[PDB]
Amino acid sequence: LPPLSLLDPAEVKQKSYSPESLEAMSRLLEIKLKEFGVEVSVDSVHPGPVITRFEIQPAAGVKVSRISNLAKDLARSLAVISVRVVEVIPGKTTVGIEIPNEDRQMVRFSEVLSSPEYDEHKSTVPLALGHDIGGRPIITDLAKMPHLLVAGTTGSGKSVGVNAMLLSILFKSTPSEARLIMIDPKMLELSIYEGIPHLLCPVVTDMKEAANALRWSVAEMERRYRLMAAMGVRNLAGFNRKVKDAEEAGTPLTDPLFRRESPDDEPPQLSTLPTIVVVVDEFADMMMIVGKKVEELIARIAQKARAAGIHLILATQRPSVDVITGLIKANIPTRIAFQVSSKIDSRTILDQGGAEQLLGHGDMLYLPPGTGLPIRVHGAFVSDDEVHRVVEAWKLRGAPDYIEDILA
Amino acid sequence: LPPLSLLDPAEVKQKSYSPESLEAMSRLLEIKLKEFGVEVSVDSVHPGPVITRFEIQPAAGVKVSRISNLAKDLARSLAVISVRVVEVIPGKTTVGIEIPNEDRQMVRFSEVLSSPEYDEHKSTVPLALGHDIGGRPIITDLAKMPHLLVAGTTGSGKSVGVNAMLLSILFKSTPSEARLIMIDPKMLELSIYEGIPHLLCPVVTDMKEAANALRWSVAEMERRYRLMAAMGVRNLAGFNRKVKDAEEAGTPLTDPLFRRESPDDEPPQLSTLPTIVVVVDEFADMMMIVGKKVEELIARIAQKARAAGIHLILATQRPSVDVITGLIKANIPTRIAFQVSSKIDSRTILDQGGAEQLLGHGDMLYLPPGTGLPIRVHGAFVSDDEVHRVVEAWKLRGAPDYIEDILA
Ligand SMILES: Nc1ncnc2c1ncn2[C@@H]1O[C@H](COP(=O)(O)OP(=O)(O)OP(O)(O)=S)[C@@H](O)[C@H]1O
Numbered sequence: 001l002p003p004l005s006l007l008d009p010a011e012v013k014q015k016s017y018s019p020e021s022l023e024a025m026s027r028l029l030e031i032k033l034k035e036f037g038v039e040v041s042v043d044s045v046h047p048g049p050v051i052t053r054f055e056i057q058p059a060a061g062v063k064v065s066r067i068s069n070l071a072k073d074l075a076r077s078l079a080v081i082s083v084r085v086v087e088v089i090p091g092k093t094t095v096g097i098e099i100p101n102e103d104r105q106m107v108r109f110s111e112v113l114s115s116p117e118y119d120e121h122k123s124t125v126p127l128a129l130g131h132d133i134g135g136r137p138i139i140t141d142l143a144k145m146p147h148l149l150v151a152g153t154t155g156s157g158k159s160v161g162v163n164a165m166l167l168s169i170l171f172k173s174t175p176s177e178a179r180l181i182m183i184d185p186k187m188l189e190l191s192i193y194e195g196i197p198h199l200l201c202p203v204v205t206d207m208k209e210a211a212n213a214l215r216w217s218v219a220e221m222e223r224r225y226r227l228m229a230a231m232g233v234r235n236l237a238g239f240n241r242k243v244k245d246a247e248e249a250g251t252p253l254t255d256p257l258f259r260r261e262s263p264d265d266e267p268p269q270l271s272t273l274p275t276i277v278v279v280v281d282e283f284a285d286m287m288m289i290v291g292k293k294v295e296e297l298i299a300r301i302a303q304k305a306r307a308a309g310i311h312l313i314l315a316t317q318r319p320s321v322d323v324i325t326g327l328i329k330a331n332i333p334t335r336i337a338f339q340v341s342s343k344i345d346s347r348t349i350l351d352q353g354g355a356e357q358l359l360g361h362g363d364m365l366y367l368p369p370g371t372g373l374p375i376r377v378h379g380a381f382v383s384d385d386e387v388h389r390v391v392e393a394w395k396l397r398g399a400p401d402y403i404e405d406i407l408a
Numbered sequence: 409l410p411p412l413s414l415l416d417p418a419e420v421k422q423k424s425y426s427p428e429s430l431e432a433m434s435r436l437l438e439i440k441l442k443e444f445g446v447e448v449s450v451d452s453v454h455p456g457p458v459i460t461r462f463e464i465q466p467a468a469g470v471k472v473s474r475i476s477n478l479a480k481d482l483a484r485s486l487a488v489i490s491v492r493v494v495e496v497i498p499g500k501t502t503v504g505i506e507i508p509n510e511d512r513q514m515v516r517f518s519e520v521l522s523s524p525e526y527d528e529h530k531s532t533v534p535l536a537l538g539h540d541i542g543g544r545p546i547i548t549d550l551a552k553m554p555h556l557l558v559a560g561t562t563g564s565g566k567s568v569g570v571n572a573m574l575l576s577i578l579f580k581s582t583p584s585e586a587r588l589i590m591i592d593p594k595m596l597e598l599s600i601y602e603g604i605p606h607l608l609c610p611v612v613t614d615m616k617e618a619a620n621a622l623r624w625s626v627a628e629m630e631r632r633y634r635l636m637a638a639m640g641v642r643n644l645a646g647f648n649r650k651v652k653d654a655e656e657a658g659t660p661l662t663d664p665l666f667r668r669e670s671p672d673d674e675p676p677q678l679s680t681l682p683t684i685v686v687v688v689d690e691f692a693d694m695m696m697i698v699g700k701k702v703e704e705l706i707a708r709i710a711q712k713a714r715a716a717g718i719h720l721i722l723a724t725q726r727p728s729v730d731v732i733t734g735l736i737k738a739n740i741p742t743r744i745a746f747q748v749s750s751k752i753d754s755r756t757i758l759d760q761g762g763a764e765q766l767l768g769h770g771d772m773l774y775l776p777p778g779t780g781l782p783i784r785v786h787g788a789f790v791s792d793d794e795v796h797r798v799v800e801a802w803k804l805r806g807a808p809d810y811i812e813d814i815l816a
């Protein structure tokens with residue numbers, strides 16, 4: 001219900017990337033790559049808001065992996081700050097060489113959310129990530145992911161990305177449509193959402209309580225499954241349809257699971273269930289303080305919480321095999337990698353290299369479900385101050401409704 | 409003569425840094441520092457265009473060097489990208505803790521040059537650096553430096569800084585007022601100035617020719633000294649005064665050094681001498697390819713070229729003791745350090761730590777002459793494209809005038 005006008009306006013886009021300099025760079029590219037062990041010719045150029053992609057056609061034989069490993073050296077020989085090598089460009093035989101624009105224009109949240117893709121999204125938990133390399137809005141749906149793993153080192157834009165996702169939901173769903181459980185071992189990053197009506201419990205700081213929060217989630221998931229079974233529905237959307245039709249028909253449904261034990265008892269009237277999202281700002285700590293029990297709970301939620309409408313968003317600044325385990329990854333195919341420190345760290349999160357070539361400040365590689373190759377997305381910027389406003393707007397529309405059993 | 413309108417406009421400054429969040433951060437700071445081995449209390453807050461400085465008053469005893477070493481950990485504990493620790497604040501007993509603003513506003517060249525400090529600067533070689541932490545224009549004078557050393561690692565803003573300095577001169581001085589010798593071993597960064605009338609020779613790429621360029625400079629310096637001696641003047645400003653007064657008096661001076669050897673010979677009429685600037689994009693190579701001969705020439709130019717109106721600007725991306733030797737430093741007190749990789753690298757350039765705590769993208773520590781402490785300056789941004797325009801504007805006002813003896 002809170003107005004999008006609470007956000008900061010989109011900034012001017014004084015672009016101008018004269019075809020002049022673009023031909024020269026194309027020219028330099030071929031020259032510089034040649035000095036290395038690779039023959040190449042520029043096929044086309046695509047200027048964007050943050051980067052410019054120069055599609056190139058390698059000579060037969062040359063291993064594209066060879067170009068990828070030359071990224072550092074090529075950027076140097078070109079005197080540019082960074083270079084991202086795109087090994088394969090969907091639908092083409094060309095290789096991508098992406099180069100940062102001198103004056104990159106920031107991508108504002110208000111800009112992404114003002115897109116029809118978002119304004120008309122039906123999901124209860126859409127996530128407006130940002131703009132793609134051509135500047136087109138990239139709006140996703142957490143419900144279809146159906147879980148998300150997020151990594152990136154300091155200054156990469158992980159926390160801003162996490163806030164953009166929380167605000168995507170807060171701008172489209174009311175507390176009866178979506179509820180959240182936030183886990184933030186340190187105080188900082190997520191402490192500000194404290195109090196909004198969407199919260200199921202206060203921001204979790206204690207790791208043991210974090211563990212309980214996941215157990216509660218599992219319990220609620222199985223509880224929703226018994227409900228859906230008793231109702232003859234396959235998922236949350238179906239459940240909510242049934243309950244909604246019965247009401248509109250002047251015949252509200254009664255909890256088919258309620259067992260009367262006292263003459264006094266009356267079956268409670270069913271109501272639509274909210275989509276639940278569990279967001280962990282940093283779960284490397286959980287995986288360290290608690291351990292195996294945490295993996296177990298995560299792995300269980302990931303495997304079957306989708307139908308129950310319970311979704312996980314796990315973010316980590318420490319992308320190690322100890323934190324992002326194969327057990328965690330096996331049931332969470334959707335990945336988002338902001339800038340990471342090494343190719344090794346890139347593979348742990350994406351099972352692929354490349355996130356080490358990102359710029360930082362929101363720059364990311366998004367790996368949607370049933371996709372082998374990630375698409376580059378320029379994370380939308382949302383300031384802690386904008387977060388504070390929306391949060392205040394929500395604390396005015398409803399008081400906190402914590403359930404002191406979740407952390408118990 | 410080329411119009412400032414050739415530059416890009418200053419971008420909006422949607423700031424807003426509510427005193428709210430500033431009190432909280434002041435609050436966290438004391439909290440977080442306490443967790444480390446340091447008691448502290450915030451005395452005041454000064455929000456700026458790029459950073460916000462929180463002055464703090466350490467408890468008696470605690471070593472300010474202790475806070476400096478905690479910058480990394482402190483930034484981490486605060487969940488911010490970077491923290492700069494200012495050990496002493498001129499005229500105060502406080503210590504500075506500088507924190508980057510979420511949405512930093514870029515500082516545009518047009519904005520700095522539009523300041524009266526620049527527009528009314530008399531020097532032939534003023535260098536508009538950018539904005540200080542409070543957003544005030546910092547315009548310097550190369551002639552009073554009288555030489556400048558510049559360091560910074562990749563993506564720090566060294567080359568943008570060097571272009572802003574070259575354009576500072578190109579927007580105030582005509583070729584009869586200022587001439588340049590550009591040395592750029594690689595092609596990239598400085599190759600674009602090729603052809604402007606100000607150039608004394610083509611952009612130098614060969615290291616041996618770079619060596620000759622420096623020798624020519626020494627020769628020209630001594631030649632100007634004999635000229636000034638013969639004219640009874642102490643410096644270039646004085647020389648140019650004399651030659652200018654004589655002309656206005658209908659009596660142009662004659663080269664007092666010209667020795668007639670033929671009946672044919674006629675003493676040439678003197679003319680005002682241009683201020684000469686030698687800019688090396690990367691002299692780490694020179695110091696490596698040639699060696700000791702290059703140190704010697706640099707050391708000689710640095711020691712006595714000021715009066716002769718000849719000035720050096722030496723920039724390096726590889727700040728090692730092998731490159732920035734004490735010999736070089738003894739005669740070049742003015743320093744500019746953009747972000748560097750380590751405290752060691754910071755000491756090599758500033759003989760002090762701190763450049764390792766910079767943000768990059770133009771952020772710098774400027775050490776003016778007769779000063780022990782550097783002032784933070786947010787470098788003014790100038791795109792390669794803006795440089796291209798100004799270059800074209802100059803190539804229309806004058807043809808190249810190379811002296812094929814300088815590199816010979
Ligand atoms: N999408 C973005 N667009 C522009 N700047 C961004 C973006 N995301 C992040 N930044 C910059 O980085 C800051 C926020 O970074 P975070 O998202 O908190 O980074 P982090 O990866 O969580 O690591 P930290 O700094 O340790 S919190 C902002 O204040 C900006 O200055």
Ligand SMILES: Nc1ncnc2c1ncn2[C@@H]1O[C@H](COP(=O)(O)OP(=O)(O)OP(O)(O)=S)[C@@H](O)[C@H]1O
Nearest residue numbers: 080081102562563564565566567568769770787789
């Ligand atoms: N003063 C500045 N303001 C904003 N962005 C800047 C500034 N200086 C540098 N940048 C960014 O960095 C780029 C230029 O960096 P350079 O100044 O060439 O860096 P460098 O330190 O010389 O190292 P490179 O990238 O190896 S050339 C610009 O294209 C911008 O994207």
Ligand SMILES: [Mg+2]
Nearest residue numbers: 158159189487
């Ligand atoms: Mg963070």
Ligand SMILES: [Mg+2]
Nearest residue numbers: 079566567597
């Ligand atoms: Mg450079």
